Design a protein around this ligand. Structure first.
Ligand SMILES: *[C@@H]1O[C@H](CO)[C@@H](O)[C@H](O)[C@H]1NC(C)=O
Ligand SMILES: *[C@@H]1O[C@H](CO)[C@@H](O)[C@H](O)[C@H]1NC(C)=O
Ligand SMILES: *[C@@H]1O[C@H](CO)[C@@H](O)[C@H](O)[C@H]1NC(C)=O
Ligand SMILES: *[C@@H]1O[C@H](CO)[C@@H](O)[C@H](O)[C@H]1NC(C)=O
Ligand SMILES: *[C@@H]1O[C@H](CO)[C@@H](O)[C@H](O)[C@H]1NC(C)=O
Ligand SMILES: *[C@@H]1O[C@H](CO)[C@@H](O)[C@H](O)[C@H]1NC(C)=O
Ligand SMILES: *[C@@H]1O[C@H](CO)[C@@H](O)[C@H](O)[C@H]1NC(C)=O
Lengths: 233, 233, 233, 233, 233, 233, 233
């Protein structure tokens, strides 16, 4: 909370804090069922970033012109469309990456998902060191559920929890490193004139809108003054 | 809380935070009665978005002109009325969608509603695996009520709670995805001149109001100066 | 708390947050007596909105002119008085409505009031299913008092509490819907020239006050400069 | 706390929040002694508003001129003194009223004061329904002291607490209503030229101070420039 | 905390909130020893206000000129020195008064100090109603120490605590009233020309500093422009 | 939290608060396994600063020109590249240093890492003063895990925790001192003309961008005005 | 926390709040070992102020010129170097003093340090009034460690804690008084022309930097306009 606010202050690239806060304000609840744990985990991992990607796409006020150009046979930039589309895509990819990083550093989804299948043989008590893995499926399935796990005589819930959480944090750090390296290479490589042409078209849109609102003002002023004569009368 | 404030800061499309905060500051209380659970759940789900829709309609300062035009036989735009009405409607639909999304991601209403009817056969203890569903109605009815559920010997309250809550979260995510796709398609499709005409009428209203207040100022200045002569005397 | 602050930020129609915060910062205490519960409940429900109505009336800086006009036989607007008075009244009605809505959504007053009389026959234990209603008066009277209700062997306090609270929330939602519909109809119906005339009189008041303060400034400047001569001496 | 800050934001008539916050940040401690309870209660009720009244008097920057005029036999306004003095008094009365309202709505002082004398015959256990009122004095005296009241076998502390607190809240609401009605009548009745004369004298003071500081500036500039010649040397 | 921030907002006379916050953020620890309780109490009461007085003296940026004038045999105001010195002193006295008021309203220091000596004969159990006062010294000495007082069989710690705390609050209120009355009389009595002369000297200092910085600017501009010629080269 | 916000306010050199807050908002979880404790500790110590270094590199908007110059055989500054590259590097080194300092002052990583190997012979109970170090490996491995350490009969967890934490704090203070001394020497030694040349190139970039956007504006204005003629038609 | 923020608001001399907040956000951990307690205490007392002193030295943007002048045989002020160096030193001394004051008023370091050596003969139980001081070393060593001190049958931890904490607070108050007196004397004594000369050199630096950036702007504008011709082409 305090951190997201601080990030916002620094900013004062905004959907990042939106995703972070939405994750922190989300009631994560592992169903703790052997048939659905994997589904729920991978779902929390995969669906929200997809939705964030779409949301980033729609909130961009120039998708309309992209569709317009992709529609015509030959429209009134042979390639700036590529450039502006790729810039929009790059802008959009921030929130899903942030969501994945956050949900991995906090090993909740990983714990929910890989709890039933993973091998925890050093954690299972030595007494029940020999029993059908189908029962261990049901048992380990309840591991991320504090109020439900009632087999302290068999498995230490806390040890396994810390184990899988460390695994998740390691994966999250590797993911962050890979993303940072890719971003570094991209900025170190990248296409010049298209940027100037899009700057031109942007300034064109701005001056068109401002001229239009000004001429609307001045042309409505005449009508206003004509009709306000009776208003005094 | 911290999240809503952050969203407001980002904004600095406002009723969204209003709806979110109103939900968070709402004492949700499932009656935990077999005759009314469904009613209360679906009510909390359906009524508040309807009220929010109406509220969005009334708070818009141009509904009056819409009624005026819909009233006359032929008024002084043959179709911009369609356009401005649809834009108002689109502006209004935000808050109900936000309310539904929030109340689904937090599986409270879903839990209250579908608790008595849904089949929880893996959760009911094996001892009472055979008993009239009418008794299970009363029993499962109390599931969302922590302080009231006194049948731990029959059903695990926590397991069923997590189950139905995961179901609710899944439904909420699907709803969010569908809404986002629909919004994407709408922005990718959509009617051009009507926008310019409404821009014209807006500028007309603005210049009319400003000219009126200025002429009121200048015409009252004469009276003020005439009457202030005795004020010095 | 966080919500009221957010509402204030959105605003930046102010007494609404005042009423909400005053309710949240109010020590509601049901006397839990069969003779006074009804009185206290309906009082908390009815008196504060009346006081808020009066407060809204007095804080409006143009009530004086309303009294002045209502006093004279024929004063220097034959009907704008109706208009400005009704606008003041409409401005004033916000806070009482907000108070009623808030105190109904939180079923405290309803619980305190209708606890002794209402019939709770499914909640009373089956053992004491037959006993004089006068004793049940005293017993149910203590229901909203956690620290005082000492008859768990007779009535479940929590079940009845949730029941009556759901009733209160339903009533509050119906009230909100009715108020919203009425507001929608009012804005959809409503008297034109009176608005312009009141705008004129307002601008007149403004220019009169500004001209008066300016002439006071300039006429006191002479005296100031005359007397400051000795100040240097 | 959150409420006082919100009130301050609305304001952005300031001593009101000062009094409210000072009450909230005050360690109220009922001595729980039959000889002093009444004294302490009425003291907390009466002394702080008197001090607030005095504080409002002194903080007003024009009390000096009031004393100056009340001192002379005939000073250089035959009656604006009445007007400005009454306006200062009205400004001052806010904080004491706020303090009384707050301390009554929270029935602490009332409870401390009227605990030993008031008749609580329905609350005293039936076993000790007959015993000298002098002992009940000592006993009921300890009622507002949670950690000290050790006679649960005789009197329910919570029931009596709620009772007297409801009484206090009722008295506070009546007080608020009376004050609001009086304010409404005052604004509906009230003396015109004195206001303009005080506006004149205020503008006179302002222009005198500004002319004085400006002439000080310009007359010191000469000296500054004369002495800065050696400063370069 | 919330109150100090509100006071700061109102202000936006600053050391007052500094003293208040420093008191609230101070680990008050009564040594609970018969030989040192009095010392510690009176010390916390007396030393911090003295230090605050000194701090107010030093932070004032015109003490230097006061020393300069008090040093010379006859300096370049025969009495404004009295005036500015007294105004500085008055400005300085705020923080010590605030500290004393705060530390008295919260009867901690009073409790620590007057615990061993004061007579608590109604609080001491009747069994030990006769024992050497030297033992009662040690016992009552531990009264302000919750974790240390182990004589519940002899003295009620809470009753005596409330007693002495009420005494402290009474003393604090009397102190506040006396200070307010003195301030009222001072403002109602008070020396005119000295104020204008100090206003003159202040404006002189301001214009001297501004002229000096401006002439430094302009005279360094020449050097800057002369040396920047090679900078381009 | 409160501290990071205060630092941000002081700033209003920003990644420092980012790193601090990210550490505070990080679920540190020592796997408490003899095979992985060292790995996890040193990883939390080493990886995040590396990632922060990379992040500082990429976020700098002039890495592109550095790559461009390092790419060409001879580009259009023979050495300012060294200067700007070193300044970027210096700017980048802040966040890793801050992270290391923070994670050392809070002896979590140190405790997790050096728990299994370090010799705690004064802390191990005297009964088990003679047992294979391989068992002590497993035992001491669980020391940073409160919920897991179940050998209070062998080792005091708290004593060893405080011991290793003091060691970590000492190391952190030495690190801070060394870094501060190095920074002092660097600022006391350091290359002059390169700074002016980079200032020149920066101003060049600024004026180029501003001239380009202005000429885009003016050249699009013609098109806008040409096409807005039909817009009125 | 709230206090530091308030201080920052008052300020809006900044490292003071930095030091205060850093102390409050520091995990103080007394090793509770007879061999190291003294070391840790005096270290926390002495090292951080030294580091703060160095930090204040380096953060000052004019240390470079001080080194430059101290380096040359005879540089281009025969004594303003003394003046600016002393002013920098005075600016730097704030944070260490603040740190010492804070860490003394909260008697943590004092308690950790002087616990093993100090004589607590009135606190040690009378049974063990005769035993080798070497054992009391180990015992009293654990006094500042709540979770570790297991000799309630020998020494009251709380009494000794309060004792040593009062000692620390007394020392802190004396330190504050001495520092305030020294500051008062310094301001009352203090070297005039050097201040004006440093003001001159500061204004010189400012105008040089501004002239340089302006000439860079204007000289790069020509190149920008020359190269933007092809940009339109
Ligand atoms: C293993 O199980 C036995 C009994 O089955 C129990 O006594 C023992 O404490 C268990 N050990 C662990 C580590 O769970
Ligand atoms: C099922 O019921 C039996 C007795 O009816 C009880 O002993 C057992 O613990 C119950 N099991 C569960 C899972 O509720
Ligand atoms: C009803 O009362 C009987 C005894 O009077 C008690 O044993 C039983 O638990 C009670 N049931 C409820 C639901 O209160
Ligand atoms: C009244 O006193 C009797 C014994 O004196 C006790 O058993 C009973 O519970 C008391 N009742 C109340 C309501 O205090
Ligand atoms: C007084 O002391 C006796 C025994 O010495 C004890 O039983 C009694 O409760 C005490 N009373 C009080 C009020 O402390
Ligand atoms: C050491 O172990 C013995 C038994 O093995 C136990 O009684 C004693 O309390 C232990 N001492 C410590 C300091 O752990
Ligand atoms: C002193 O020690 C004895 C036994 O050694 C114990 O009974 C007594 O309570 C102790 N007193 C204190 C004040 O620790």
């Amino acid at each position: 909370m305090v951190q997201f606010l601080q990030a916002n202050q620094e900013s004062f690239g905004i959907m990042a804090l939106a995703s972070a806060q939405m994750y922190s304000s989300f009631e994560f609840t592992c169903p703790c069922l052997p048939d659905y744990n994997y589904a729920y985990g991978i779902g929390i991992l995969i669906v929200p970033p997809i939705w964030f990607f779409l949301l980033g796409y729609v909130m961009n006020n120039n998708i309309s012109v992209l569709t317009e150009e992709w529609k015509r046979p030959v429209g009134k930039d042979p390639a700036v469309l590529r450039y502006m589309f790729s810039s929009m895509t790059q802008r959009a990819l921030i929130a899903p990456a942030v969501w994945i990083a956050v949900t991995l550093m906090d090993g909740k989804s990983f714990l929910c998902a890989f709890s039933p299948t993973a091998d925890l043989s050093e954690f299972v008590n030595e007494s029940y060191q020999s029993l059908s893995q189908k029962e261990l499926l049901k048992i380990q399935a309840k591991i991320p559920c504090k109020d439900i796990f009632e087999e302290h005589e068999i498995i230490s819930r806390e040890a396994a929890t810390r184990y899988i959480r460390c695994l998740s944090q390691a994966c999250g750090w590797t993911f962050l490193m890979v993303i940072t390296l890719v971003a570094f290479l991209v900025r170190a490589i990248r296409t010049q004139a298209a940027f100037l042409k899009t700057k031109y078209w942007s300034h064109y849109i701005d001056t068109e809108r401002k001229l239009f609102d000004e001429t609307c003002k001045e042309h409505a002023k005449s009508f206003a003054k004509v009709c306000i004569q009776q208003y005094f009368e």
